[PDB]
Design an enzyme around this catalytic site. Structure first.
Site, PDB file in Angstrom:
ATOM      1  N   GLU A  35      -0.435  44.522  20.494  1.00  0.00           N
ATOM      2  CA  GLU A  35      -1.675  43.899  20.343  1.00  0.00           C
ATOM      3  C   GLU A  35      -2.328  43.934  19.080  1.00  0.00           C
ATOM      4  O   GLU A  35      -2.965  42.773  18.708  1.00  0.00           O
ATOM      5  CB  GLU A  35      -2.757  45.039  21.297  1.00  0.00           C
ATOM      6  CG  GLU A  35      -2.541  44.783  22.838  1.00  0.00           C
ATOM      7  CD  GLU A  35      -3.063  43.680  23.309  1.00  0.00           C
ATOM      8  OE1 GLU A  35      -3.651  42.796  22.624  1.00  0.00           O
ATOM      9  OE2 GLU A  35      -2.770  43.380  24.723  1.00  0.00           O
ATOM     10  N   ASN A  46     -11.900  35.575  20.787  1.00  0.00           N
ATOM     11  CA  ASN A  46     -11.401  34.801  22.100  1.00  0.00           C
ATOM     12  C   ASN A  46     -12.239  33.621  22.267  1.00  0.00           C
ATOM     13  O   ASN A  46     -13.195  33.496  21.744  1.00  0.00           O
ATOM     14  CB  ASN A  46     -11.491  35.804  23.190  1.00  0.00           C
ATOM     15  CG  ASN A  46     -10.734  37.107  23.322  1.00  0.00           C
ATOM     16  OD1 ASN A  46      -9.657  36.987  22.539  1.00  0.00           O
ATOM     17  ND2 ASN A  46     -11.581  37.989  23.555  1.00  0.00           N
ATOM     18  N   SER A  50     -15.993  35.994  22.930  1.00  0.00           N
ATOM     19  CA  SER A  50     -15.830  37.433  23.119  1.00  0.00           C
ATOM     20  C   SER A  50     -14.925  37.923  21.883  1.00  0.00           C
ATOM     21  O   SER A  50     -14.283  36.644  21.252  1.00  0.00           O
ATOM     22  CB  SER A  50     -15.295  38.292  24.250  1.00  0.00           C
ATOM     23  OG  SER A  50     -13.996  37.288  24.516  1.00  0.00           O
TER      24      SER A  50
END
Ligand SMILES: [Cl-]
Ligand SMILES: [Cl-]
Ligand SMILES: [Cl-]
Ligand SMILES: [Cl-]
Ligand SMILES: [Cl-]
Ligand SMILES: [Cl-]
Ligand SMILES: [Cl-]
Ligand code: NA
Length: 129
Positions: A35, A46, A50
């Site tokens: 991640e 995103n 977001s």
């Protein structure tokens, strides 16, 4: 802060993530590696507008407030910036809520695609826990 592999395993264990909801410590370290590459300061936007924040790339769509994700929720009740600290406490507490939300660690796309079903114990191998 960029954590070392064993350093983060130890911090995660200390904050109660080891076997949390049945997920061994290696799963959490693996997820963090893919991640954020162990970087607490990592942020990524995103397509829906977001943003993912911190070591575990927690999404402002649901889990934290950044004041710029229209219609989003803040289910961890924290500013998204709190997820970027050198201290992982906030990220871990929020992660506990996420992994309890129904789909387990599948919430983390990198975990599902890169960690799930693999030899995750290798992530804590050699580590003095
Ligand atoms: Cl590594
Ligand atoms: Cl464990
Ligand atoms: Cl493990
Ligand atoms: Cl917002
Ligand atoms: Cl909310
Ligand atoms: Cl910490
Ligand atoms: Cl589960
Ligand atoms: Na939000």
């Amino acid at each position: 802060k960029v954590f070392g592999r064993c350093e983060l395993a130890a911090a995660m264990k200390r904050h109660g993530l080891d076997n949390y909801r049945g997920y061994s410590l290696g799963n959490w370290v693996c997820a963090a590696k893919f991640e954020s590459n162990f970087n607490t300061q990592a942020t990524n936007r995103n397509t829906d507008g977001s943003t993912d924040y911190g070591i575990l790339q927690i999404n402002s769509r649901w889990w934290c407030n950044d004041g710029r994700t229209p219609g989003s929720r803040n289910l961890c009740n924290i500013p998204c910036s709190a997820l970027l600290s050198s201290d992982i406490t906030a990220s871990v507490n929020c992660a506990k809520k996420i992994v309890s939300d129904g789909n387990g660690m599948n919430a983390w796309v990198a975990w599902r695609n890169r960690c799930k079903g693999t030899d995750v114990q290798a992530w804590i191998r050699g580590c003095r826990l």
